[PDB]
Amino acid sequence: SCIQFTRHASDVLLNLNRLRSRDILTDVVIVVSREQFRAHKTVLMACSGLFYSIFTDQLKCNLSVINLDPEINPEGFCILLDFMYTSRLNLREGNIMAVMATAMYLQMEHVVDTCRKFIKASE
Amino acid sequence: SCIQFTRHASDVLLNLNRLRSRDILTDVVIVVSREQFRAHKTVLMACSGLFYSIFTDQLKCNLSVINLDPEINPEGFCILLDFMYTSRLNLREGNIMAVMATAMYLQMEHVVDTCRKFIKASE
Amino acid sequence: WVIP
Amino acid sequence: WVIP
Ligand SMILES: N#Cc1cnn2c(Nc3ccc4c(c3)CC(=O)N4)cc(Cl)nc12
Ligand SMILES: N#Cc1cnn2c(Nc3ccc4c(c3)CC(=O)N4)cc(Cl)nc12
Ligand SMILES: [Cl-]
Ligand SMILES: [Cl-]
């Protein structure tokens, strides 16, 4: 018999992104080649099958630094990290291949789906 | 020029609630009289003006235990904590006064608004 | 607020 | 997915 506040989940996510911008309570640095990205482990797990696996591991759960595969593109990661915190995906002709490869590695199925559909439409 | 995934914010919140149920990466215990509630500081801040103030404080940000005012009702807190993690508010005739008082203390304006409207309709 |  |  609950009532539901339609905008609540979006409002929570907006405030999680504000915390990220102000670097408040971030508990991990994701290293992608020469670049570093601070984030909240809980948000990374909630968005990515890869981080969900990493941070439920009894040893990796305690790491403050996670190094991604050297084949991962920093811009592609940056676009996906912004997506995690905003629901908005900056998908462009110049970045779509890197975004799709990064989303496959991060196990972000919905992003992979759409990248596949956008590529199929251009061929 | 971003695209947006409509269900993303709801999916993030659902996974944050799963983390809470499994007690994964919870970093605070909220003590309300004889009861204890484990939560994620980032979610509490994102939902509540009171926790936002508490956890941006340079000393309180590091506390693992937060004790609420003894006038706060544990059930009222439990209902609001569930709301924070789900967008669903279990508002009932028997709990509305406690929910509204707890939402005023926690500075959860949207919950306060609706409690006020539901009370006005019954008088 | 809505009836979900 | 939508155009926001
Ligand atoms: N507890 C918990 C919890 C935290 N996060 N999380 C999940 N995170 C996840 C796992 C796989 C995938 C995605 C997110 C997006 C995607 O495409 N795949 C799942 C579950 Cl079943 N549970 C949890
Ligand atoms: N950074 C950050 C950040 C984390 N959380 N958070 C806010 N949390 C908040 C503050 C006040 C109120 C509510 C939530 C619900 C309500 O009724 N009042 C606000 C801002 Cl402006 N910023 C942040
Ligand atoms: Cl996704
Ligand atoms: Cl609220």
Is A90 touching B (CB cutoff 8 A)?
A: yes
Contact (Cβ atoms closer than 8 angstroms) between residue B77 and residue B68:
yes
Please enumerate in sequence order all residues whose Cβ is within 8 A of that of B89, keeping only pairs 6 or more positions apart, or say none. A2, A3, A4, A5, B79, B80, B83, B99, B111, B114, C1
SS (H, E, C) B99-113: HHHHHHHHCCHHHHH
Contact (Cβ atoms closer than 8 angstroms) between residue B14 and residue B84:
no
Query: In terms of Cα–Cα distance, which of B81, B88, B87 is closest to B106?
Result: B81
Quote the ligand 1 centre to B57 CA distance (angstroms): 31
Is A88 touching C (CB cutoff 8 A)?
A: no
Give the domain range for residue B81: 1-123
How many structural domains comprise chain B? 1
What span, in angstroms and rounded, lies between the C-alpha atoms of A63 and A67? 10
Please enumerate in sequence order all residues whose Cβ is within 8 A of that of A105, keeping only pairs 6 or more positions apart, or say none. A50, A68, A69, A72
CATH number at residue A46: 3.30.710.10
Neighbours of B62 (CB within 10 A): 8
What span, in angstroms and rounded, lies between the C-alpha atoms of D4 and A102? 23
Cross-chain Cβ contact B42/A55 below 8 Å: no
Going from the C-alpha of A35 to that of each of A32, A67, A72, A77, the distances in angstroms are 5, 10, 11, 10
What span, in angstroms and rounded, lies between the C-alpha atoms of B116 and B122? 10
**Burial zone of A106 (CB within 10 Å; 0-12 exposed, 13-18 middle, 19+ buried):** buried
Report the relative pairing of strands B65-67 and B28-32 from DSSP bridges.
Answer: parallel
Core vs surface per residue B7-38: b (16+ CB within 10 A) or e: ebbbbbbebbbebbeeebbbbbebbbeeeebe
Spell out which residues line ligand 2, taking CB within 6 angstroms.
A 15, 18-19, 22, 24; B 45-49, 52, 107-109
What number of H helices and E strands is found in chain C?
0, 0
